């Protein structure tokens, strides 16, 4: 199917962070057990950006672009803010595995697509500066870290997606 992205809540006034080239796409999850994709987009629209901002949200079968790409972001709380080409938030409010999987698939596909768009390798949590990095990986590896965030692995584990499965899906693409 064609990928559809809702840009209705794209917050243009967010600050410039660092400069090109941006070597990373960041994989996050919201840490919010109750919010919908629209709730997240609406809060992101109005919030103090210092609390954290990002570029995309995946949830409820939809993808919303909520911030600029190729801009950096205040998403990971340390030096790799200045490497953020894009930062994708998966919602955490799924009632069932089936509903989770619909969004998980979109999440994998979007992370891969954003890496392609940025000219970055479709790799997960490698040591190279370039690639797709989780918030956990940024927290543990970036210079000047101030975060304690370790998303999205705990939420993926809630729904039976292991570290290895997530890496395989990012790096090889989805299969049946």
């Amino acid at each position: 199917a064609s990928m559809e992205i809702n840009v209705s809540k794209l917050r243009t006034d967010l600050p410039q962070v660092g400069v090109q080239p941006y070597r990373q796409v960041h994989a996050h999850s919201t840490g919010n057990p109750h919010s919908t994709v629209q709730n997240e987009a609406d809060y992101h629209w109005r919030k103090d950006p210092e609390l954290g901002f990002f570029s995309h949200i995946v949830g409820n079968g939809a993808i919303m672009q909520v911030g600029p790409v190729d801009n950096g972001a205040w998403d990971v709380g340390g030096g790799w803010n200045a490497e953020t080409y894009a930062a994708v938030e998966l919602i955490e409010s799924h009632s069932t595995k089936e509903e989770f999987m619909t969004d998980y698939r979109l999440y994998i596909e979007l992370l891969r697509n954003l890496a392609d768009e940025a000219g970055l390798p479709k790799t997960l949590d490698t040591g190279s500066l370039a690639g797709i990095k989780t918030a956990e990986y940024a927290t543990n590896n970036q210079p000047n870290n101030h975060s304690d965030h370790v998303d999205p692995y705990p939420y993926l584990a809630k729904w039976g997606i292991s570290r290895e499965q997530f890496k395989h899906d990012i790096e090889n693409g989805l299969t049946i």
Binding site: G52, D75, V76, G78, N81
Partner: peptide, 4 residues
């Protein structure tokens, strides 16, 4: 998420 999270300027730090």
């Amino acid at each position: 998420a999270x300027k730090x």
